[PDB]
Design a protein around this ligand. Structure first.
Ligand SMILES: NS(=O)(=O)c1ccc(CCNC(=O)N2CC(=O)N3CCc4ccccc4[C@@H]3C2)cc1
Ligand SMILES: [Zn+2]
Length: 258
């Protein structure tokens, strides 16, 4: 009886196995744009993905992850609110059953069709597993998706999804350039938070870009054909794999922009 996003094992149940679900710095949150304050102390954000080496794409039963070689400082996130160097290890998405829901963060309570999370770990902790035990261990770059024009840089991901339909399937996924998933502007909001899936560890500096990327209806329809189940199990479509907004508590959301 494992956690998931069904009626019986969804986010409202997670606190029974993971009591930190009701903690002081949980994610995601609603970003109230009128309350977020410009912070002139934020240093410029540095997304350096030119040498990123993707390896594999995996259906883990909760989402699909594109994994990177993180055994040296090829693809790194620095600057903004961050101290030191954060290495890209994987990206994944959260999405809905309908275009009006799917994002984890919300903006003035608006839900987007989907949300991309580029996950990075603080190299001062040596490995990912040590980093998630630290309050500044991870930096997640969050990017909203809205349905409109196709995103050409997403199509290589969309076209491999038929090969990883079910939980536990993986496929080789080399030479994918995550620069193709970024919006034009790097203006962002930032706050201290958590993983949005169990174990819900409070280890993340969140950096949420203001400008959404546009994907086509056909692109997101292909996400919604994935399965939560393994092969040879009853088919359950992988949709609505998002955690709703959590209490902000004793936190301030800071804006990089005026
Ligand atoms: N919604 S979210 O962005 O808040 C979110 C981000 C991250 C996570 C943790 C997901 N776990 C992971 O991504 N894992 C776990 C791991 O132990 N390893 C071993 C180290 C290694 C080496 C190479 C590639 C991949 C891993 C994986 C990464 C959960 C949720
Ligand atoms: Zn995520």
């Amino acid at each position: 009886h494992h956690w998931g996003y069904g009626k019986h094992n969804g986010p409202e149940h997670w606190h029974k196995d993971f009591p930190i679900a009701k903690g002081e710095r949980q994610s995601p949150v609603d970003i109230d744009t009128h309350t977020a304050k410009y912070d002139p102390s934020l240093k410029p954000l540095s997304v350096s993905y030119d040498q990123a080496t993707s390896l594999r794409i995996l259906n883990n039963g909760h989402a699909f992850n594109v994994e990177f070689d993180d055994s040296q400082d090829k693809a790194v996130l620095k600057g903004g609110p961050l101290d030191g160097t954060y290495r890209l290890i994987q990206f994944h998405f959260h999405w809905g059953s309908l275009d009006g829901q799917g994002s984890e963060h919300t903006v003035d309570k608006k839900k987007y069709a989907a949300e991309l999370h580029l996950v990075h770990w603080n190299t001062k902790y040596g490995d990912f597993g040590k980093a998630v035990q630290q309050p500044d261990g991870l930096a997640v770059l969050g990017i909203f998706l809205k349905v409109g024009s196709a995103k050409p840089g997403l199509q290589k991901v969309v076209d491999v999804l038929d090969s990883i339909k079910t939980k536990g399937k993986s496929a080789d996924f080399t030479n994918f350039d995550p620069r193709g998933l970024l919006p034009e502007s790097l203006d962002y909001w930032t706050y201290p938070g958590s993983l949005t899936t169990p174990p819900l560890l409070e280890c993340v500096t969140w950096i949420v870009l203001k400008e959404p990327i546009s994907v086509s209806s056909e692109q997101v329809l292909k996400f919604r054909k994935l399965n939560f189940n393994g092969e040879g199990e009853p088919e359950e479509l992988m949709v609505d794999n998002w955690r709703p907004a959590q209490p902000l508590k004793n936190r301030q959301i800071k804006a990089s922009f005026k």
